Design a protein around this ligand. Structure first.
Ligand SMILES: [Ca+2]
Lengths: 279, 4
């Protein structure tokens, strides 16, 4: 299948070179997989989700995304026009308030929740969790991410946007999960992207068009935008049967475009998520 | 603890 005039990031993950505009992908499109977006929530009524999105848990007064961020990330995972895995099932877990902030205890509860909840869902091709959030180092937050991963969920987390070593941030610094840095459309590391030995992979994160609240769209930037590209790619590869939740990050790194990025500090992987699609 |  081919989506013409696709957002640049989708095109990038299906090409060996920058500058293309078509997103090439297998028609299966992540059908049978499930992705939990742990964020400010998801506007499940957005037409772009085609009824494939559902809020399953909130830690606040409402399950509504009054922010937009969560809806944006979810859209990159699996909306019709802006998503990597266009037929996946999306589950929203609201651990961040409408200002986009949240306490570590809530974020941890949200991760433990997903580890259990997945047992009540029909996700024959596998389960993924996308965490476009983080703060200063916390061994407790790292441990929660490690538990989620151990439970059989492919965990993808943002590296962070402080243009610093991700070793000082969580859950980015948990080695067992898939830590995602950001790149721009010219194959440069995004100016704000964290870096470091703990990064596993890069994905498109600068100027990413996706869904927004009020049934709209908008372009924003961040490692928060790169993460759902990788989470969606994982869902897509699991549906194809190429990898499992335990090994998806490694598989993605192994099949990545290698050495194409610029401004990568020594010691940081030069790997860009790639779907290896061949018609 | 964001706005990330
Ligand atoms: Ca890792």
């Amino acid at each position: 299948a081919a989506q013409t005039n696709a957002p640049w990031g989708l095109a990038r993950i299906s090409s060996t070179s920058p500058g293309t505009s078509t997103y090439y992908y297998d028609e299966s499109a992540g059908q049978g997989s499930c992705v939990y977006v742990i964020d400010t929530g998801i506007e499940a009524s957005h037409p772009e989700f085609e009824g494939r999105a559902q809020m399953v848990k909130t830690y606040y007064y409402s399950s509504r995304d009054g922010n937009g961020h969560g809806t944006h990330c979810a859209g990159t995972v699996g909306s019709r026009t802006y998503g990597v895995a266009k037929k996946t099932q999306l589950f929203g877990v609201k651990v961040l308030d409408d200002n986009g902030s949240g306490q570590y205890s809530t974020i941890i509860a949200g991760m433990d929740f997903v580890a259990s909840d997945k047992n009540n869902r029909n996700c024959p091709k596998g389960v993924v969790a996308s965490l476009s959030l983080g703060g200063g180092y916390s061994s407790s937050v790292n441990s929660a991410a490690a538990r989620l991963q151990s439970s059989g969920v492919m965990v993808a987390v943002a590296a962070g946007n402080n243009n610093a070593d991700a070793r000082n941030y969580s859950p980015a610094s948990e080695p067992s999960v898939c830590t995602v840095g950001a790149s721009d459309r010219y194959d440069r590391r995004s100016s704000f992207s964290n870096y470091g030995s703990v990064l596993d992979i890069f994905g498109p994160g600068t100027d990413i068009l996706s869904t927004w609240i009020g049934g709209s769209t908008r372009s924003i930037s961040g490692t928060s935008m790169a993460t759902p590209h990788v989470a969606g790619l994982a869902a897509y590869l699991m549906t194809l049967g190429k990898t499992t939740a335990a090994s998806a990050c490694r598989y993605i790194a192994d099949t990545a475009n290698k050495g194409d990025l610029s401004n990568i500090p020594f010691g940081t992987v030069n790997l860009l998520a790639y779907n290896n699609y061949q018609a | 603890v964001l706005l990330h």
